[PDB]
């Protein structure tokens, strides 16, 4: 089997991407944030505290003839940005882009943090990291990909995120028309539960490539590119007037600036992030200070190849017995 679904930016900055997912019978379609940095499929629901729902579409398990309470199971997750959610668990039929999994754990939110409430466009998350990170207790549950894997034509999914445009998540096949050149594959460590890999270096604009190992994760659920302070300083030093602002929470730059590209290495290959992908616009409406899309990871504990990086590539998440990542230009 295969599946193919369009993913759409939630706003004009590509802050996140939503993908329609069918849950239950008859189908309830919710728009979920596919997140290769986490491993829970959770949804706003009829069980969510009413004051914490503000415009989201909710899953109502009592209206699904295939829903079944997973007795005793609870979940609770905290994300790297400080947001969180928790609740109980149903199993139900879940379909993405024509690919159907029966018995998928659908984690129903009883509580969500304010950042989720305040984003009316995201009805939940669909985690695509390794199932060892799934938070369901006392019996950990499998991701949608893990459940689908055996049925797929090939045990892979691909992320093709758009810049200010829709893109595609495919399951079970590699669309050879969706990228240019060849795909360069690189080794993955699953020891932390992430799609963790080592970039071979970077360049700023037209500058020389610096060969250096940068360990990080491929994370579709993180907006920006978080890299070591040395790398980030070298980037922003090429932008007149750019500075790190403690009060804003990262590097900012004059909105009148033209940003240089940023290249990252994948083995001997190179992925180029155009400068315009690194502009996240005014820090507040009407401001002439703009927020940068490359930020230091020094306070995170891990480097994160988020959407800023991934949307410059066609990315293969190869879930074979020994997983690998593939990157191609497009």
Curated annotation (Swiss-Prot):
Residues 17-328 form the Peptidase A1 domain. It comes from the Eukaryota. One of its GO terms (molecular function) is aspartic-type endopeptidase activity. GO terms for biological process: proteolysis. The active site is at 35, 199. It catalyses: Hydrolysis of proteins with specificity similar to that of pepsin A, prefers hydrophobic residues at P1 and P1', but does not cleave 14-Ala-|-Leu-15 in the B chain of insulin or Z-Glu-Tyr. Clots milk. Keywords: Aspartyl protease, Disulfide bond, Hydrolase, Protease, Signal, Zymogen. Disulfide bonds join 255-290. It is an enzyme of class 3 (hydrolase). Its EC number is 3.4.23.22. Belongs to the peptidase A1 family. This is Endothiapepsin.
